[PDB]
Every structure is written in structure tokens, then in C-alpha cells.
Structure 1
Amino acid sequence: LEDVVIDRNLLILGKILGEGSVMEGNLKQEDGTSLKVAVKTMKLDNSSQREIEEFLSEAACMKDFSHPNVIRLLGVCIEPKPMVILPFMKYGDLHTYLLYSRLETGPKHIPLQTLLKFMVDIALGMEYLSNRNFLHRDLAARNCMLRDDMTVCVADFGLPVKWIAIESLADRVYTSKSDVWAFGVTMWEIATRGMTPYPGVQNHEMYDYLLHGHRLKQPEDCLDELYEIMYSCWRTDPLDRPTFSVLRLQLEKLLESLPD
């Protein structure tokens, strides 16, 4: 607590940004200046201090995370409900951004070079968490945030059937190679500019679908080289899947093989 806790009086809450749930707010910092934050309210099982122990545990680790492509944890505040304090990012989540991209008034058609750069950013972020054996367990375009410099950072980690790896559906187990699987789905979302995974397949059909060897199909405008990287993320054996440090360099290489 000594490290992550923030006095509730230093926090002012405002409108709802999404539904626990997310809310806007102002964090009064130690330099006197006030910072805009997003406050994620957390509903935990208070029948025991079990879930809160694991809550304050990760938060202490998450507050020490420092990487441009990984979201920053500012701290936690208590009411007795905990609340995660994160930086506010006005450009919002990447998923909505991709959709807007396909509408006039909204952002310009995102070229492929920019789409890969989104993937690289996420891969770099995941590479950082992976190096610290920290699992995300909920990676998706909706959880990837755009910084004010339009660089992507990963979020919502710590503390969705169509993103869950095949092993994690049956055995109900989670490894970093399960995050790689979700990362490949995230790549698909980006390459399709916001499509929902597995059109035609309902959620209750996903296990038999995957179990029979069927995977996400290649988008029309997607390069064979880019879909290879995506596909390698969905290999049945988690050991056959590449690490984030391999994926990251694959994407950096491919992006550099393109013009501006």
C-alpha cells in the first residue's frame, strides 16, 4: 500500500468513459499540478482479502513498469472499493479509432505502414511484460490505447472468447504464448480496421471451430508475409508459437521493407 496508494482527496471524478467501469478525473500530483486520469473502478470479492492481496501485489509491480508502449500506473485510491488510476488518453482506444478511420470527418484512411507500426508498438509493449513474466490475459485492440503522439500502448493487463487461445479454453491455463495468440487476433483486428473476429462463427462454436484446425482468414488487402506472422500466433501447440521478441523484430523488419 505504501507505494501505490493515493489519498482519495487528491482525486476528483467526472463523467463515465465506459462500462466495473471507467471514469474521467483529475489527479492532483505532488508538484502541485493536476493531471488528467482515467479511473477504473474494481469490483472484487470482499468475502476474503484474497483478491485484494493479488490486487495490491500486481499494482506495486505495475507501478514500476516503465516503457513507452506500456501504459503507466499512477496508483490506487480507496473509497471500501479500490480504483486504478491511469493516464487519460484523449485519442481513446485503438479499436474505435480503426472504425472511425473508415468514416469521413474521422481520421484519414490509415495506410499499411501506419497499421504495422501499431502492431510493432504493441509487440514492443508485450515484449516488455513478457520479459518480466507478466501475463496480460486480456489483450485486444479495444485495450490498446493511443498516446498523444499516436504511439500505441498496451493496457487493462493485471487485476472475450474470440481472443482466448485454444489451450486456455479447455485446460483453462494461461501462459505468455496465450497472450501471443491474442496478439495475433489483435493484428487481425488492425489489418481489418475493426472487424470482429470469426464472422459467421458464434462464441459457443469457437472451441470446435479451432479444434478442427480452422483459423482467422486472411484479409483481402493483407500481405501473405503479414498473415504468416498472424498465423504463427495461432499454432495449436503453444511451443510452436513465436515469442514477442521474435514477432516484434519480424514486424519491424517488414515495416522497414516498405516505402514511406
Structure 2
Amino acid sequence: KLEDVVIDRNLLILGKILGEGEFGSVMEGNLKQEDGTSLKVAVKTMKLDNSSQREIEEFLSEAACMKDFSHPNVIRLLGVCIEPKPMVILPFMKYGDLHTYLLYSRLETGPKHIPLQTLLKFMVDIALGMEYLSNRNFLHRDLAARNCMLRDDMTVCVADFGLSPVKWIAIESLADRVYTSKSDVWAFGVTMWEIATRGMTPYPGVQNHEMYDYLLHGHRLKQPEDCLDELYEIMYSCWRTDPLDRPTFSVLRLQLEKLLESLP
């Protein structure tokens, strides 16, 4: 398990901090590869509960499982490093996260106004990434626009740069410890709304502490102004009270492809 993913620490050069949290940090870095070239990397350092070997074993098991994953809409895991501090090595993406990109697109110096066709392709990319993980019974647990990364060819891939998200958490997950693929589907619906609104924080006028009661009374994210009824119908189906009534990522992906293909 260790031998399959662990990269020698002297092959990694650490740079500046990109982001910092309570249980981790994201840093820019250089990784010397097998072919003798150096690749630009994003290094996610994680604080593990070292009071038992349960977290390090579960960490290495997930890393060994991820190494074998290969999909264009899922971030590629290059390997891991141990300084007992584990480090996740991922490719560095100059276009950054999708949430920041959507916000820059609304400003003059940032990318040009994103058309509807491009917004929907961002969604199809995430759905394709999530369909791949859902098929291998892998739970994301932190799906949001901030965790979706833009590759150099402008394709979107799913990642987890979280360093610890009440407004993305499924109603059943707020009531109980319960978290399934249908909870990732709820978070996807919220991720879609973030894209459609070009980076708005979910539920304007609603506090984080009011969220459970707000959802319990049947209220959901409102339809955005420039949003097609067919698109809002897809994101709303992600927020059905009973998780069983929510569509699979496979169904969601095809609905989005069919809707994207019907546009000029």
C-alpha cells in the first residue's frame, strides 16, 4: 500500500503557501519525475490524528485506491510524501479553481463573459467526474465550485482542496451522521447553482445556523435570473427530501449533455 503511492521526499521542492486552514495547507511545488523532467505541483499537507494508526492506514488505503483512478474530469494523484506529516501531490493548474474563475469573469481584466454553452459544459465535466467516482463507490464529501479545478485546456476536474460547508450539506446529513452518493448529488445541485449564478454564495439572506430549519420547511435555492427552466429542473431534482428520489450522477450527466446539445 505504501510502496505504490509514496514518492521520495528529496524529489519534491516546496514553495509558497497558496491556501492555509486549521487541519492543513496548500502549497506550490516542484516534483522531479521518472523521465528526468520537473513538473509544477500543488501540495496538500494534512494533519492526521496520530493517537492511533487508523487515520494513516485509511489515508494510505485511499491514496493507493486513487493512484489507480484515471479519468479526465477527476484530478490525477501523482503520489504522496511523508515528512509523520502526509503530503498529497497533485498537478498545479494555473487557471485555478472554478469558483474564483466565475467571479473574475464578471470583472473587466478577468476572463471574458462566460456564455451559457460554456457554463453547462463546466457542469457536464463535473457530472462526468462524479459519475466516474460514484461508479467506484467513492464519496467526494466536499463538492463545491471552489473544489472544481480548471485544466490548461479549460476542461473541469473534481478535486478536494478542503483544509477542515453547511450550505452544501444534504438535509439527511444535517439531521444524522449519514452521507451517501445521493448526498454528493445534493452538493452537485448546489455546485450547479454556484455556476449558473457566476459565483454567488448559496441562500442569500439565510444564515448558516438557520439552514436545517429552512430546508425542513421545504425551501430550496431559488431559480437564477438567466437560468433556463430545464436547467433549474435538473438542479432542483438534486435537492429532493428523500435521497432515493434524487437522480444518479449517470442520469444527471446525460440530462446535462442532452440540454447542452439542444442549445445554439
Fold match (TM-score > 0.5)? yes
Question: C-alpha distance in 1, partners of 2:207/2:47?
Answer: 28
Question: C-alpha distance in 1, partners of 2:140/2:156?
Answer: 16
Q: Give 5+ residue unaligned stretches, structure 1.
A: none
Query: Following TM superposition, by how much is the alpha carbon of 1:157 offset from its aligned partner in structure 2, in angstroms?
Result: 8.0
Question: C-alpha distance in 2, partners of 1:52/1:158?
Answer: 18
Residues 158 and 42 from structure 1, CA distance in 2 versus in 1: closer, same or farther, beyond 3 angstroms?
A: same
Residues 246 and 157 from structure 1, CA distance in 2 versus in 1: closer, same or farther, beyond 3 angstroms?
A: farther
Question: C-alpha distance in 2, partners of 1:76/1:166?
Answer: 34
* Of 65-74 and 16-25, the range deviating more from structure 2: 16-25
Question: C-alpha distance in 2, partners of 1:150/1:207?
Answer: 36
Aligned length in residues = 259
Question: C-alpha distance in 1, partners of 2:215/2:161?
Answer: 25
SS in 1 for 2:42: strand
SS in 1 for 2:60: helix
Aligned equivalent of 1:31: 35
Q: Give 5+ residue unaligned stretches, structure 2.
A: none
Question: C-alpha distance in 1, partners of 2:197/2:3?
Answer: 44
- 1:138-149 aligned at under 5 Å gives the runs 138-149=142-153
> TM-score with structure 1 length normalisation?
0.98
Question: C-alpha distance in 1, partners of 2:169/2:63?
Answer: 24
Query: Following TM superposition, by how much is the alpha carbon of 1:80 offset from its aligned partner in structure 2, in angstroms?
Result: 1.6
- 1:115-134 aligned at under 5 Å gives the runs 115-134=119-138
Identity of aligned residues (%): 100
> TM-score with structure 2 length normalisation?
0.97
Q: Deviations over 1:150-170 (max 9, x none)?
A: 000000189900000000011
Residues 175 and 157 from structure 1, CA distance in 2 versus in 1: closer, same or farther, beyond 3 angstroms?
A: farther
Question: C-alpha distance in 2, partners of 1:64/1:88?
Answer: 20
- Please identify runs of 4+ aligned residues in structure 1 that moved more than 6 A: none
Question: C-alpha distance in 1, partners of 2:200/2:259?
Answer: 23
SS in 1 for 2:235: helix
Q: Deviations over 1:19-72 (max 9, x none)?
A: 251000000001100001000000111111111111001010111110000000
Query: Following TM superposition, by how much is the alpha carbon of 1:114 offset from its aligned partner in structure 2, in angstroms?
Result: 0.2
Judge conservation of contact 1:135–1:158 (CA < 8 Å) in 2.
no
**How large is the RMSD of aligned CA atoms in angstroms?**
1.1
Question: C-alpha distance in 2, partners of 1:64/1:173?
Answer: 27
* Of 15-24 and 100-109, the range deviating more from structure 2: 15-24
Question: C-alpha distance in 2, partners of 1:63/1:199?
Answer: 39
Query: Following TM superposition, by how much is the alpha carbon of 1:244 offset from its aligned partner in structure 2, in angstroms?
Result: 0.3
Judge conservation of contact 1:136–1:158 (CA < 8 Å) in 2.
no
Q: Deviations over 1:64-83 (max 9, x none)?
A: 11000000001110112000
Query: Following TM superposition, by how much is the alpha carbon of 1:171 offset from its aligned partner in structure 2, in angstroms?
Result: 1.1
Question: C-alpha distance in 1, partners of 2:204/2:212?
Answer: 15
Query: Following TM superposition, by how much is the alpha carbon of 1:196 offset from its aligned partner in structure 2, in angstroms?
Result: 0.2
SS in 2 for 1:201: coil
